[PDB]
């Protein structure tokens, strides 16, 4: 019969990240100065914010309470916070995920989930809790990200071009048209735990040369229309996160959008 946690709103906002009673922390670098501003601006925009994140909320649960009201407050807050920040990113492209979380206006303790919310993620390192954010509170409502956001790396010899066993290379030329599963969650710890596996597909030429090396030149769509964002389909360390939060919390499985497409080209050698 899980809990309900309240959606962020100015109403209901704590005044900063965790109530004070803790905090996002980069890794520790000897010195001072300007080189710790560094620090913190490159620790904004590793996976490891994410996951400091919720495991910082998971840490807060076992300490404190589910059922306390002020646990209660620090998910809906911690949350909003990155709901800001990601918002923030979507506005305004190309901009830090620190300046993103740290943009004075609108103030991000005052950040109101039902008017703000928007059907648009990042795909930068803030996305997995503002999906979680969407199933606490979006009841079901579909959300979007650009496939040349998802920080996709494609690994040609898992998908059908390793049919060149045939040895048949060279060349040079060989029309590669298929569609694959893809698990982002192998190697992206952010794209893994909200899309997880995804059906992709490939048009382009695979270049063998006589001597096993190749190279796929190549472009790259969603197969699917869309993915569904449970439990089931988290995938890696952070999924699992959002797993155990999701079933402790009230909330609602919603689809993700996943449109545009990449220009990919990747080598290697038989
Ligand atoms: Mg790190």
């Given at each position: 019969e899980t809990l309900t946690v309240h959606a962020p709103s100015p109403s209901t906002n704590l005044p900063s990240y965790g109530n004070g009673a803790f905090s996002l922390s980069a890794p520790h670098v000897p010195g001072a100065g300007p080189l710790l501003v560094q620090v913190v601006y490159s620790f904004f925009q590793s996976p490891n914010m994410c996951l400091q994140a919720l495991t910082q909320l998971e840490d807060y649960?076992?300490?404190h309470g589910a059922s306390n009201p002020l646990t209660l407050q620090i998910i809906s807050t911690n949350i909003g916070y990155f709901c800001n920040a990601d918002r923030n990113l979507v506005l305004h492209p190309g901009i830090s995920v620190y300046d993103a979380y740290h943009f004075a206006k609108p103030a991000p303790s005052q950040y109101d989930y039902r008017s703000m919310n928007m059907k648009?993620?990042?795909?930068?390192?803030?996305?997995?809790?503002?999906?979680?954010?969407?199933?606490?509170?979006?009841?079901?409502?579909?959300?979007?990200?650009?496939?040349?956001?998802?920080?996709?790396?494609?690994?040609?010899?898992?998908?059908?071009?390793?049919?060149?066993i045939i040895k048949s290379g060279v060349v040079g030329t060989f029309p590669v048209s298929t569609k694959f599963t893809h698990a982002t969650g192998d190697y992206n710890?952010?794209?893994?735990?909200?899309?997880?596996?995804?059906?992709?597909?490939?048009?382009?030429?695979?270049?063998?040369?006589?001597?096993?090396?190749?190279?796929?030149?190549?472009?790259?769509?969603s197969y699917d229309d869309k993915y569904?964002?449970?439990?089931?389909?988290?995938?890696?360390?952070?999924?699992?996160?959002?797993?155990?939060?999701?079933?402790?919390?009230?909330?609602?499985?919603?689809?993700?959008?996943?449109?545009?497409?990449?220009?990919?080209?990747?080598?290697?050698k038989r």
């Amino acid at each position: 019969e899980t809990l309900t946690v309240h959606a962020p709103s100015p109403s209901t906002n704590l005044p900063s990240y965790g109530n004070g009673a803790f905090s996002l922390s980069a890794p520790h670098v000897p010195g001072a100065g300007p080189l710790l501003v560094q620090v913190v601006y490159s620790f904004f925009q590793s996976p490891n914010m994410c996951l400091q994140a919720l495991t910082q909320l998971e840490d807060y649960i076992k300490k404190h309470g589910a059922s306390n009201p002020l646990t209660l407050q620090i998910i809906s807050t911690n949350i909003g916070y990155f709901c800001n920040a990601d918002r923030n990113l979507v506005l305004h492209p190309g901009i830090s995920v620190y300046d993103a979380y740290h943009f004075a206006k609108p103030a991000p303790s005052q950040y109101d989930y039902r008017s703000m919310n928007m059907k648009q993620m990042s795909g930068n390192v803030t996305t997995p809790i503002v999906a979680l954010a969407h199933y606490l509170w979006g009841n079901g409502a579909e959300r979007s990200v650009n496939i040349a956001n998802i920080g996709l790396k494609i690994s040609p010899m898992k998908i059908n071009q390793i049919k060149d066993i045939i040895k048949s290379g060279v060349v040079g030329t060989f029309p590669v048209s298929t569609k694959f599963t893809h698990a982002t969650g192998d190697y992206n710890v952010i794209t893994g735990a909200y899309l997880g596996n995804i059906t992709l597909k490939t048009e382009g030429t695979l270049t063998i040369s006589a001597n096993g090396s190749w190279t796929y030149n190549g472009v790259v769509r969603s197969y699917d229309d869309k993915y569904d964002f449970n439990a089931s389909t988290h995938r890696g360390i952070i999924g699992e996160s959002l797993t155990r939060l999701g079933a402790m919390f009230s909330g609602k499985e919603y689809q993700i959008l996943l449109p545009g497409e990449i220009h990919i080209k990747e080598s290697g050698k038989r």
